Design goal:
- The structure is cut from a larger assembly and holds one copy of chain A (about 260 residues), one copy of chain B (about 40 residues), one copy of chain C (about 30 residues), two copies of chain D and one copy of chain E (about 260 residues).
- Chain B has about 40 residues and is mostly helical.
- Chain B has two helices and no strands.
- The radius of gyration of chain B is 22 Å and the shape is rod-shaped.
- Chain D is built from six helices and no strands.
- Chain E is mostly helical and about 260 residues long.
- The chains are: A mainly alpha (about 260), B mainly alpha (about 40), C mainly alpha (about 30), D mainly alpha (about 100), E mainly alpha (about 260).
- The interface between A and F is medium-sized, with 13 and 12 residues.
Chain lengths: ~260, ~40, ~30, ~100, ~260, ~50
């Protein structure tokens, strides 16, 4: 039934000499039939239910090898497969953990506009059911407000699969965020309080942050250069801009338009 | 007149702002003052 | 004929363009 | 005239109600302006694209084309779409304050 | 969703990708419209075996987005596969670009075609007369007279005097309609000087038009040449309306200049 | 059909609240605002 694949797909073959044959196996799919959604012949599903199971697992090992551009390649093709109104499996043991997995990595892509346009495809599966997708939408919601601890209580609660490469980018985009938000109007902080606001006990990682930005390494002190003094007393910036605007008042006042 | 091609389907304002304030806060605030004198 | 249907019709856009520019002169010239 | 207008509201009517691309397309659609659409198909035209900027997080730009979609409307009473825009117009203003 | 597989570097996926870029060219037309335009990269990468159909779908997608010349330069460089299909509502979209761009190019080339001339593609000039051959053979000569002026070319207008439409008075009442809408003296005299050396080369040489044109053209020796033929023919009856229309219309200085060529 | 818009108002309630509290009270403990906003935690009361 033209498979050539059912021996080494479930067991870990990490970046071995299968993926070149595997893509060449997927090349031989294209000579038989297109990956056009096959509007006719609904009974023949071996091009649809047996061929998409290759394409969803082909997205799965893309993230273990840290392959970011080819990761969204397979995931966009899966999105074009559940667009089909032809009756398929409604889901499997993977569809939540792949569609909401795209929700979790596009979170890390720092593009919030595409984060909320997925929400058309599942209205009820966010709060009242489908708890494994309730967890990513509640996560970025907690990243929206100031809440940081309850974010990492969700980093104590990863129920579905590993999610390892995603929360580590979510580590990294919080690390510069607190190293950003250490720069507020704070007083002297000793080398324990803001030393433990991220996670760390006392490595030299604090010297990486304390020499990246200010809050100078001293006798158990974070020095505050809370100046915010240089910018005011600007008459000229109105005096250039308003002199433009007052002439614009006289344009639509006297001369016929 | 009055068509709207359908594709799909004072006396009131000041108290509404006053309904906003004491919506769920001390409606009949009448007797707690009798009970706050011996406490406070 | 059909060839005259466009050549004579572009001929008056030539002729129309002056007139709106012309009264544009007289909105201010009569005021002075 | 009036072919640029009605063929785009009737293009949107389930493209909003689907997740198909259709929203950055209507950004790069040149047919945003038919420039005159008989005061009733024009009035809800700013509404159907008014929800588009709302649903993809464009807040402050949306509330002015929600308001313009409300005040170009006729004098009827059984108005259940006006029942919808009067709901939606100040959803996005709760998002702003 | 086929836009993601445009970096394979095995070329056979690209011909499998362009197999879907024609029949469903209206729904994910939304998608690959402005975000991805990587046609021109493989168009320039020396494979080739493709870049033919690749310029079609960009001639499709930049057309509706107002980038007509971006479609048109791809419509030029696409070759045969762009022009193999003309049974649609799309052939009206492309000849209203190209021939309109052609005639607004040739007006500039009516001024100065010599020196810094434009790179006239052979497809840019070869579908002009081909569609004009579609006009010569589809029985319409109220428009075969039309584009033959609109090409702003002398000899193809001279070519169509012998066509599948006979000459009782067609190409003779054309100049009656051409003199009225006659734009300048620059395009006028060049066309008018070749039409009347073939009127003498016609079967029955018409005499009032060859005089009316010549005073518009100011050849004070050429009417004396065809007067010499009428002296050679020796009948003053047909040597009459060539002469009193010459006296009635022409200038005094023209009649005082042509008289040297009559007495010699 | 508006629920996905309604669910994100919790960010706007708390920014309305923190403007209301900072305009009302001048010198307020951060271990008092959380009990008034029923946040159940002062350790993120610094964080909002």
């Amino acid at each position: 039934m033209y498979e050539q694949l059912k021996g080494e797909w479930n067991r870990k073959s990490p970046n071995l000499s299968k993926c070149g044959e595997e893509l060449g196996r997927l090349k031989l799919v294209l000579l038989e039939l297109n990956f056009l959604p096959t509007t006719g012949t609904k009974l023949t599903k071996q091009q649809l239910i047996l061929a998409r199971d290759i394409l969803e697992i082909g997205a799965q090992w893309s993230i273990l090898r840290k392959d970011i551009p080819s990761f969204e390649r397979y995931m966009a093709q899966l999105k074009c497969y559940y667009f089909d109104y032809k009756e398929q499996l409604p889901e499997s043991a993977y569809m939540h953990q792949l569609l909401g997995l795209n929700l979790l990595f596009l979170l890390s892509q720092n593009r919030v506009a595409e984060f909320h346009t997925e929400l058309e495809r599942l209205p009820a599966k966010d709060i009242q059911t489908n708890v494994y997708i309730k967890h990513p939408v509640s996560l970025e919601q907690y990243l929206m407000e100031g809440s940081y601890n309850k974010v990492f209580l969700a980093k104590g609660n990863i129920p579905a699969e590993s999610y390892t490469f995603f929360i580590d980018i979510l580590l990294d985009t919080i690390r510069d965020e607190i190293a950003g938000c250490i720069e507020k109007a704070y007083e002297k902080i000793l080398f324990t309080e803001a030393t433990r606001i991220l996670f760390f006990n006392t490595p030299k990682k604090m010297t990486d942050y304390a020499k990246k930005r200010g809050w100078v390494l001293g006798p158990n002190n974070y020095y505050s250069f809370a100046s915010q003094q240089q910018k005011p007393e600007d008459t000229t910036i109105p005096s250039t801009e308003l002199a433009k605007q007052v002439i614009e008042y006289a344009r639509q006042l006297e001369m016929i338009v | 007149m009055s068509e709207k091609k359908q594709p799909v389907d004072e006396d009131n304002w000041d108290d509404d702002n006053v309904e906003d304030d004491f919506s769920n806060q001390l409606r009949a605030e009448l007797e707690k003052h009798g009970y706050k004198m011996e406490t406070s | 004929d059909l060839y005259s249907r466009y050549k004579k019709l572009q001929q008056e856009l030539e002729f129309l363009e002056v007139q709106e520019e012309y009264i544009k002169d007289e909105q201010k010239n009569l005021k002075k | 005239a009036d072919g640029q207008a009605t063929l785009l509201n009737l293009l949107l009517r389930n493209y909003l109600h689907y997740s198909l691309y259709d929203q950055a397309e209507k950004l790069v659609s040149k047919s945003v302006f038919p420039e005159q659409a008989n005061n009733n198909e024009w009035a809800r035209y700013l509404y159907y694209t008014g929800r588009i900027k709302a649903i993809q997080l464009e807040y402050s730009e949306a509330r002015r084309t929600m308001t313009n979609a409300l005040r170009k409307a006729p004098q009827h009473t059984a108005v259940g779409f006006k029942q919808t825009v009067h709901k939606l117009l100040i959803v996005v203003e709760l998002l702003l304050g | 969703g086929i836009i993601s597989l445009l970096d394979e570097d095995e070329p056979q996926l690209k011909e499998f990708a362009l197999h879907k870029l024609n029949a469903v060219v209206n729904d994910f037309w939304a998608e690959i419209s402005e975000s991805v335009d990587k046609i021109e990269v493989l168009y320039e990468d020396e494979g080739f075996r493709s870049r033919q159909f690749a310029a079609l779908v960009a001639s499709k997608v930049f057309y509706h987005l107002g980038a007509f010349e971006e479609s048109l330069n791809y419509a030029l460089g696409a070759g045969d596969l762009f022009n193999v299909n003309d049974n649609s509502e799309y052939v009206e979209t492309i000849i209203a670009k190209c021939i309109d761009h052609y005639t607004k190019q040739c007006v500039e080339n009516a001024d100065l075609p010599e020196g810094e001339k434009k790179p006239i593609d052979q497809r840019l000039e070869g579908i002009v007369n081909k569609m004009f051959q579609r006009c010569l053979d589809d029985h319409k000569y109220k428009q075969a007279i039309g584009i033959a002026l609109e090409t702003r070319r002398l000899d193809v207008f001279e070519k169509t005097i012998l066509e599948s439409n006979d000459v009782p008075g067609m190409l003779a009442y054309s100049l009656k309609l051409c003199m009225s809408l006659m734009q300048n003296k620059q395009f006028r005299n060049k066309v008018l000087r070749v039409l009347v050396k073939i009127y003498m080369n016609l079967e029955k040489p018409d005499f009032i038009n060859v005089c009316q044109c010549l005073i518009f053209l100011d050849d004070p020796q050429a009417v004396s040449d065809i007067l010499e033929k009428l002296v050679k023919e020796d009948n003053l009856l047909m040597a009459y309306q060539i002469c009193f229309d010459l006296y009635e219309s022409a200038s005094q200085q023209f009649l005082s200049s042509v008289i040297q060529n009559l007495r010699t | 059909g508006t629920y996905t818009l309604i669910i994100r108002l919790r960010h706007n309630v708390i920014k309305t609240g923190v403007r209301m509290i900072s305009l009302s009270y001048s010198r307020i403990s951060l271990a008092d605002i959380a009990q008034k906003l029923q946040l159940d935690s002062p350790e993120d009361a610094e964080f909002i």
